[PDB]
Amino acid sequence: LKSVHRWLSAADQSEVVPGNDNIEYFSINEHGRREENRLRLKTLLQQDVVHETKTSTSAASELTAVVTINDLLEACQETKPSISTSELVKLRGIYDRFQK
């Protein structure tokens, strides 16, 4: 978990297809709709042939999320699961002798 968190932080999952839309404004873009940016984006989407989206899924390279000893030490000496042997002494105390 800590290693995948570190890998996510390092990758940062940012800077994807920046500045896709081109600058195409024109002077006569007035005397009508004031949402011309939305219409231009609509057309830029529409000029595409079809939603291919045949992208290579292996580009992520998720296998690189490897652990390190420093990451290993993120255990931070977690609390014990068993409170104390004192609570369990009798367990073997009765079985110092052979079992019944």
Next chain:
Amino acid sequence: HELNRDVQQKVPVSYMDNISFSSLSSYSAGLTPLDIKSIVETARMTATARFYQESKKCGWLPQSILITQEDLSKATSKARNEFSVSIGAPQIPNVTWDDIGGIDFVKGEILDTIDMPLKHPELFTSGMKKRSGILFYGPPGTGKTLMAKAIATNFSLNF
């Protein structure tokens, strides 16, 4: 020329523009497993009705039947409603109470837990990572239902 096949009317039919098949596919075509023919025929219907109702003078004349994405969305809502009787299907009958991203501190946790199993909010495939649900707890009558519809319709797709 599937639309045109037997609609023997004066002029053929087409869309020719402006529709976005990804929107139609994603918006509510889930659980419309087949008989999209219903959808497309209802679209043809709305379009043809809007056409023929035109007067002879009318100030303008349409040359051919054209389907628009707005009527198609209307038709898909209608179809989902009329399917509701066949099989129970929630709707969006909510007014003036939606997408309050700043409603509370709880929203951030909701978003940061709904995201990881999904690609577009979080690239990781959640292979070894444990996927989990969300449980809300507290007095009744103070937010347990509207949150669900809001989240479903704003970030998820189906409810």
Next chain:
Amino acid sequence: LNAMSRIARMVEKKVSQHNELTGENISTRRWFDKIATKEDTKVVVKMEDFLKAQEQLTPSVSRAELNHYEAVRANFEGA
């Protein structure tokens, strides 16, 4: 069970002379066909067995338990 263990190791080290690659005789894991002398398998007890058992077998009734059931007997029916 001690006899079984003994004969088990016996059979293992015996087939270790024929299953190994230097012998390359049989590796079917069905060696009783190879050890056709079934009499060779005869388990027989020795004082090793009984001695270790007496060492490794506490009485299965506590002094407390025997005392308790003696007390139960003290409810000697009809008196």
